[PDB]
Amino acid sequence: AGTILLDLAPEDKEYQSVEEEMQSTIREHRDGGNAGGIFNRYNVIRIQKVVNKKLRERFCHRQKEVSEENHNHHNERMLFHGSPFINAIIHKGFDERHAYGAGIYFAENSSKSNQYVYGIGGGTGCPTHKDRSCYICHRQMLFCRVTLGKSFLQFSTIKMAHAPPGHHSVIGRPSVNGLAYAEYVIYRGEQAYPEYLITYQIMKPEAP
Ligand SMILES: N#Cc1cccnc1N1CCN(C(=O)c2cccc(Cc3n[nH]c(=O)c4ccccc34)c2)CC1
Numbered sequence: 001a002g003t004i005l006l007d008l009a010p011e012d013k014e015y016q017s018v019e020e021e022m023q024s025t026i027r028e029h030r031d032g033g034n035a036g037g038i039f040n041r042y043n044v045i046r047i048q049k050v051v052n053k054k055l056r057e058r059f060c061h062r063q064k065e066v067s068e069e070n071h072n073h074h075n076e077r078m079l080f081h082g083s084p085f086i087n088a089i090i091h092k093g094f095d096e097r098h099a100y101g102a103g104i105y106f107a108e109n110s111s112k113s114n115q116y117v118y119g120i121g122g123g124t125g126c127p128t129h130k131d132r133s134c135y136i137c138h139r140q141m142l143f144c145r146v147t148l149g150k151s152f153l154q155f156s157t158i159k160m161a162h163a164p165p166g167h168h169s170v171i172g173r174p175s176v177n178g179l180a181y182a183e184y185v186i187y188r189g190e191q192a193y194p195e196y197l198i199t200y201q202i203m204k205p206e207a208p
């Protein structure tokens with residue numbers, strides 16, 4: 001469907017709120033930066049608002065259904081999503097049929113989503129230099145509206161095909177000797193809208 005990308009100005013409070021969420025949710029991973037690279041900050045290049053009529057209709061229709069089922073609590077959250085398929089998502093929307101557990105995954109930590117931008121485990125890194133820690137190539141991630149409804153809380157790895165009865169999402173919570181970062185899972189593509197398209201670089205730490 002026909003998508004319009006609206007550029008946000010760095011002086012706008014909306015652009016600043018998105019950047020602040022992205023910068024403040026960075027964590028150090030157990031990985032040592034193997035999947036996403038070594039950095040403590042991003043360089044934000046562009047923040048674009050995604051406008052798609054058909055995707056907004058599917059999203060709003062699903063949100064109303066979830067709110068009705070969950071005593072008027074749709075429990076919407078803004079969460080990050082990193083993937084090599086950003087172009088398909090902003091035009092056709094999120095699709096659970098591509099998941100390959102089996103649901104659509106989001107993170108509350110931008111650094112978690114950054115590990116998936118080039119593929120699982122960071123794939124082979126950027127197309128040009130084949131570098132998972134590339135400081136040059138422009139990466140993209142989404143900051144999405146996610147309809148969570150009633151969330152089912154667990155510590156184990158999410159090995160479910162659908163949300164349990166009475167629930168609309170699954171949350172994998174960090175625990176000592178378990179997950180390092182929280183994972184948010186939905187099983188219907190209509191329960192996420194790709195609101196913001198963020199273009200950025202990971203920054204190389206200063207030399208002592
Ligand atoms: N839609 C569509 C689509 C179209 C064309 C091709 N692949 C499409 N997929 C692949 C499937 N999907 C997923 O979300 C997924 C499924 C399994 C694993 C991951 C990894 C993942 N990634 N990113 C994140 O921020 C994150 C955050 C927390 C945990 C794990 C993760 C993600 C949905 C998107």
Ligand SMILES: [Zn+2]
Nearest residue numbers: 126129134137
């Ligand atoms: Zn590169």
